[PDB]
Amino acid sequence: STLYSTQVKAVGGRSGTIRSEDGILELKLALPKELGGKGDATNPEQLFAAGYAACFGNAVIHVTRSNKEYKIRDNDVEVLSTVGIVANGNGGFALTVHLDVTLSGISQADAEKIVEQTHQVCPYSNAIRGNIQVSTTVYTK
Amino acid sequence: MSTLYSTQVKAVGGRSGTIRSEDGILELKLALPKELGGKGDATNPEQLFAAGYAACFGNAVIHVTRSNKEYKIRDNDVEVLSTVGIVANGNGGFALTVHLDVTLSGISQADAEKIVEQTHQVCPYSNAIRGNIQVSTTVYTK
């Protein structure tokens, strides 16, 4: 059963607007300068990069807890997502995704094992498996 | 193919933390919604995914309409309302669900349905999640 559901209205594509129905997310969008736009507002790739970095970091927190070896706080987890858009060779586009994951205060080996476990848990990682090959680098700070 | 555009976003502290693009343009705080034991202060990964996919899909609808060469449209004649949910799967795990309501102004119902079916082949979010999330879509004209 559905634990949480949300609606967002988008009008006018990549030059237009988004507004969540509850008003909490309300943003103008622009084409980036690389595509000839002004780049003075966000875009689908940035919104996706943000959703996935946040969800993945959250799931890393949950996996590190319950493994029950380390006593970590929220901000000991940073995820830097790189999301790109490319033509797919079949008249459409694909995303590319890279994640740099930085965990504070745990060993390199444990951090890598935690990130591997998290990739099986995170809803977004499971949403793209078999279509996008996500690449990941793990850092320990 | 070479990448047409790439962007970076740093997220700290999971669903109760923050996001910020490396160019400063997108910078937001996040909160668990009340349904998941939070305040709802602020946006969240499902709302951000919903927004990106509704906007990308609307843009592809525009592109497909224009490449089919029949209709005169402006950008704001396309609207996408996405519903994104998070459900329990498997063994205490979680999955995403997506429904799209697509509304095209000024075109016929059968043409709008053909356009929306073609845009699912173009939009990179649809291509990204195919076979993992079973997207449902309803098409309206007005």
Ligand SMILES: O=c1[nH]sc2cc(F)ccc12
């Ligand atoms: O991102 C997540 N991974 S574990 C989890 C549990 C929730 F209840 C909501 C989100 C997440």
Ligand SMILES: O=c1[nH]sc2cc(F)ccc12
């Ligand atoms: O969503 C899209 N469908 S057509 C297109 C062309 C672009 F250059 C960037 C995004 C899109």
